[PDB]
Amino acid sequence: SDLGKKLLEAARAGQDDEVRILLANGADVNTADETGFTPLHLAAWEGHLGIVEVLLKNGADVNANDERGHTPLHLAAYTGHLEIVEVLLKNGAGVNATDVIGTAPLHLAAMWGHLEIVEVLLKNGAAVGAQDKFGKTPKDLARDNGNQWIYELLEKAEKDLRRKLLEAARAGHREEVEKLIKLGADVNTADETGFTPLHLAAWEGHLGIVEVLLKNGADVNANDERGHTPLHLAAYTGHLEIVEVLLKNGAGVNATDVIGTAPLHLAAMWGHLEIVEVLLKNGAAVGAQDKFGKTPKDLARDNGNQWIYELLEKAEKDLRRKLLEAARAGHREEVEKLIKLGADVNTADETGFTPLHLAAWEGHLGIVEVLLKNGADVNANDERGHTPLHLAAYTGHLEIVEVLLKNGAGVNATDVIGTAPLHLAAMWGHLEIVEVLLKNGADVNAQDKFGKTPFDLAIDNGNEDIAEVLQKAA
């Protein structure tokens, strides 16, 4: 619009009567130049109050944005035209509008020292905590630029939001909380002992506030000065719903304070059955001990929470059963985790088979290595007196024999019948394994219950090759 082009220049120039003529003619009040500036942008950037008010009466978009997100309120605050600021807000300007850099009007007012404008912007709900791409707040800009009066004004406002926020989270003022967050309050501020608004909201049982704080980016796993997370406090005080929300939002179900106390310790200690079930269902480890060696089960037993003791006792039994089943099936992932939850690595079934036994019998070298480094007894015996090395030689798992011996497997161990690993290897014709056993110092003269030697068993089973080797070894 050529007519709108002259109106833009008429606003930059400041000719009220010329503008009035152009408004009665009908030239678009929201004309825009190449950048995106409208007649109301320039009336505010130059400081023509009367013109501004007149454009507002003809419905100039109070929140028009140029190609970089600058509104008329940005420009008025930049240049320091207080009368235009107050007017623009009277027409519903966005007090917290930000450009593509995240700069708000309060950034500009604070930087250039327009105290009166700063006071007004705050009176209309400006967020003191807003940060730009450089991470600067209006307080930091004032400070860095030497506006001590303004810096102290904003430093005092931030100090008040942190205090009022914490007091609201601890008091249950869901509305007051949501308000203070809009005003820039640091959602992750911490009191003298490190408690955040989330700690307090969980400690006091304000589910609503816990939901708001999380939606706004609160650290769900925030630690006080001693390692207590909000999940700790929710379990301590016993707020099922909060415990659920936190876990849904990524809470550390096994987080431990400086005393090794986890949330499960506290639920069991203070008899919060429902929360105990939620924590176990979400991966809580039953084997965790505090600095006194007490597990969650010890604390329920010591504190008289029997039904909770039963559940934890069952959970322990279930993990040691699943570990045996995982070791057999060949599920390294299931094994590794079950070991973390607290599954006894040296547990045994009815036969006396341990997870290591099952792993050697089924030929799961991966799972074998996991158990060994986790302290699995290499020379564990079953009712038959079998060692994992026995089962390995029985089945021909070469690599599992090497790893077992590597980790100290009794090479000359004998079962109840006196059978040794070398007997099995020669009996079942595992040439390569016979070479490893003898190379690892295996007894060649060993006799079983029948006086038979590994060579004799190589004869009876008719493995010439292994026979010639045992014959050469002797």
Numbering used by the authors: 12 to 485
The authors write:
D12_H12_D12_H12_D12 crystallized under several different conditions; three structures were determined in space groups P212121, P21, and P3221 at resolutions between 2.4 Å and 2.6 Å. The structure of D12_H12_D12_H12_D12 was determined in three different space groups (P212121, P21, and P3221), which gives an estimate of the impact of crystal lattice forces on the shape of the molecule. Rmsds between chemically identical D12_H12_D12_H12_D12 constructs vary between 1.6 and 2.9 Å. A comparison of three structures of the same construct (D12_H12_D12_H12_D12), determined in different crystal lattices, shows that differences between the structures (rmsds up to 3 Å) are caused by crystal lattice forces. The deviations between different crystal forms are of the same magnitude as the deviations between structures and model. The structures of these DDD fusions are very extended in one direction (>110 Å from N- to C-terminus), and thus amplify the effects of small deviations in the inter-domain angles, making the agreement with the designs even more remarkable. The rmsd for the comparison between design and crystal structure of DDD constructs with H06, H12 and H15 ranges from 1.5 to 4.2 Å. Considering the elongated shape of the DDD molecules, which amplifies the effect of small deviations in the connector, they agree remarkably well with the designs.
In this paper, we present a strategy to fuse specific, high-affinity protein binders to obtain multivalent or multispecific scaffolds of predetermined geometry. DARPins are used as building blocks to confer the desired specificity to the construct. A series of rigid connector modules replacing the DARPin capping repeats allow to combine the individual DARPin domains in such a way that their distance and angle can be altered to test different geometries, bringing the binding partners of the DARPins into a defined spatial arrangement. The two helices are not just joined end-to-end, but instead the two domains are made to overlap in such a way that the joining helix is stabilized by contacts with the domain cores along its entire length.
